[PDB]
Design an enzyme around this catalytic site. Structure first.
Site, short mmCIF file in Angstrom:
data_model
loop_
_atom_site.label_atom_id
_atom_site.label_comp_id
_atom_site.label_asym_id
_atom_site.label_seq_id
_atom_site.Cartn_x
_atom_site.Cartn_y
_atom_site.Cartn_z
N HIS B 41 20.58 -43.33 -3.06
CA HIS B 41 19.50 -42.96 -2.50
C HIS B 41 19.01 -41.80 -2.27
CE1 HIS B 41 21.21 -44.53 1.93
NE2 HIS B 41 21.12 -42.79 1.41
N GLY B 143 20.63 -38.24 8.11
CA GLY B 143 21.67 -37.55 7.86
C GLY B 143 23.35 -37.95 8.22
N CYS B 145 24.16 -40.52 6.41
CA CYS B 145 24.44 -41.39 5.25
C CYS B 145 25.48 -40.71 3.52
CB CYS B 145 23.38 -41.47 3.94
SG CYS B 145 22.13 -42.80 4.91
C1 LIG Z 1 15.62 -48.52 5.69
S1 LIG Z 1 16.72 -46.91 6.17
O1 LIG Z 1 16.60 -46.74 7.65
O2 LIG Z 1 17.99 -47.39 6.66
C2 LIG Z 1 16.81 -45.53 5.11
C3 LIG Z 1 15.53 -44.70 4.46
C4 LIG Z 1 15.45 -43.60 3.79
C5 LIG Z 1 17.33 -43.01 2.97
N1 LIG Z 1 17.14 -41.94 2.88
C6 LIG Z 1 17.18 -41.89 1.91
C7 LIG Z 1 17.50 -40.25 1.54
N2 LIG Z 1 16.08 -39.70 0.86
C8 LIG Z 1 15.43 -40.29 2.29
C9 LIG Z 1 15.65 -41.57 2.62
C10 LIG Z 1 17.65 -43.88 3.84
C11 LIG Z 1 18.09 -44.99 4.04
#
Ligand SMILES: CS(=O)(=O)c1ccc(N2CCNCC2)cc1
Ligand SMILES: CS(=O)(=O)c1ccc(N2CCNCC2)cc1
Lengths: 304, 304
Positions: B41, B143, B145
């Site tokens: 993602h 940030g 992830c």
């Molecule tokens: C639904 S959530 O909150 O778990 C989630 C939402 C958006 C993202 N992004 C991935 C990296 N790019 C921007 C968006 C990652 C996780």
């Protein structure tokens, strides 16, 4: 979101851990620059610990009696000295992994991470607080002495604790890196009883703010209180008195959540008087006091 | 003595964290050998996350669009591929700090440490468990992830988790290092509700054994039970069923304490039915389930 008891990344401290042996005793040492710091009780046998005269015991020791091993390599000891309850072993090699560091003496209520080590090898990392009675509730088996407590500010490690003793009640006592014990404790195997382990009020309030930020809001009530009224209840529940300095320190959490500090005090007051009623706050069934207001801000903002 | 929620020393994993940027998204990557692993993602905008077609989005990306930075130095990306929900970025330089490592897929109930990172920089380390509903209760801000979960066996790091998502309920979902999510979760911003978060019974029993070893013995009773009787009570309290495999795994704790597993089950049964009555076990007012029997043995023996 989510709120965890988090320790600092331990890498910078792992690079400092060494094994120190003196006679039949092996414990941990902290190698910073060309000095290895360790508890002076490394020179004691289990028998000596009952009534040790450290100056006298140290006279029978020479540099070659202190065996310092970093990984699987031996360090050459070229000097030794006692500073309070720590020994400083001067070695001929500066630790190449020495991070930027400070030695700090913390106040009760302050939190830090402990890197528990055995034979100079790190086994685990956990987060602690210096209790108001100057003990720490750690996890230390035999061989863990010399394991250290620290905080990290970006790339500078502030060492604040070195493990020395376990009291007969299973709580822990140690020194700052200048060798001065926290509290009234001594490095002698004798009756040392701890005072009252009161709850760190400012930390509980900080953690209630973390709970609100993370969505756990059931405990918020419609009341307020004053510092004096709150403190009457706090004294009754063995909570530390809350001062205007603490209220000032909680200011940013109050600003972020829109909940006045005295309102949160009133919620805490009702939690003390009514209990949790089988409910939890941030997955805990008791009021957590080992997060400082600084920790809550750091974890809720993502300081690296 | 003393028993703490302890994480593995994070040093070996800190040396693997890098920052990965794709367009306007920056998250963490794990650099092992000449491959950087990160959530796929990273190629999504916040808008794409609502209904992403990863294969289609990835076609618009070239090697030079993935910006990998290790410390303050840029890594050259010479290849990229998608494996399930992770991207593997081949770089021209093998990580000099690559530890011995394995990729493992853990079962529910298993614990691991998480090194929470932001911009490829480690901010904290905490200990977690894979819940029976395949979520983890972490502490992850935007940030985070790409932050990873791992276990260490002496000098070999077994990576078991990579952070991807936060469900609308604030619980977390992620993958193993092969990119396969734990549980039924997908890397899409849509309604994903978690199933029942049951209690990991074998872990609670292990922790009750840790409590006995560390001196907290008030909960021990004069009763015993059978696996079938215990499981009837466990089902009623949303506890996972206890199997003979679990009883076998608790064998060494039973041997060390002299308390038969079924006797400890009967103590747990009375704790479930009567509650704690305002008492604590190992400083907790609820039954802790994020220590495996292996963790209790390791912490109570001092494995480094
Ligand atoms: C639904 S959530 O909150 O778990 C989630 C939402 C958006 C993202 N992004 C991935 C990296 N790019 C921007 C968006 C990652 C996780
Ligand atoms: C009273 S206690 O359990 O805190 C304690 C007792 C003995 C020791 N040793 C120091 C190193 N040499 C062997 C003896 C250290 C601490």
């Amino acid at each position: 979101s989510g709120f965890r008891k988090m320790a600092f990344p331990s890498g910078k401290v792992e690079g400092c851990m060494v094994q120190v042996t003196c006679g039949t005793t092996t414990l941990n040492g902290l190698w910073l620059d060309d000095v290895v710091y360790c508890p002076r009780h490394v020179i004691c046998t289990s028998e000596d610990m009952l009534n040790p005269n450290y100056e006298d015991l140290l006279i029978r020791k020479s540099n070659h009696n202190f065996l310092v091993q970093a990984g699987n390599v031996q360090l050459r000891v070229i000097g030794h000295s006692m500073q309070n309850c720590v020994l400083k072993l001067k070695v001929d090699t500066a630790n190449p992994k020495t991070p930027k560091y400070k030695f700090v003496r913390i106040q009760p209520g302050q939190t830090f991470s402990v890197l528990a080590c055995y034979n100079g090898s790190p086994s685990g990392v956990y987060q602690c607080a210096m209790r108001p009675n100057f003990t720490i509730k750690g996890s230390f088996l035999n061989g863990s002495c010399g394991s250290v407590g620290f905080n990290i500010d970006y790339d500078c490690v502030s060492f604040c604790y070195m493990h020395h003793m376990e009291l007969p009640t299973g709580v822990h006592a140690g020194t700052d890196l200048e060798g001065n014990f926290y509290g009234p404790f001594v490095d002698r195997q004798t009756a040392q009883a701890a005072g009252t382990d009161t709850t760190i009020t400012v930390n509980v309030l900080a953690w209630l703010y973390a709970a609100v930020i993370n969505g756990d809001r059931w405990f918020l009530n419609r009341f307020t209180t004053t510092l004096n009224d709150f403190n009457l209840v706090a004294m009754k529940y063995n909570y530390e008195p809350l001062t205007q300095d603490h209220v000032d320190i909680l200011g940013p959490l109050s600003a972020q959540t829109g909940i006045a500090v005295l309102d949160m005090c009133a919620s805490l007051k009702e939690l003390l008087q009514n209990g949790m009623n089988g409910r939890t706050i941030l997955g805990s069934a008791l009021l957590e006091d080992e997060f400082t207001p600084f920790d809550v801000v750091r974890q809720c903002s993502g300081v690296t």
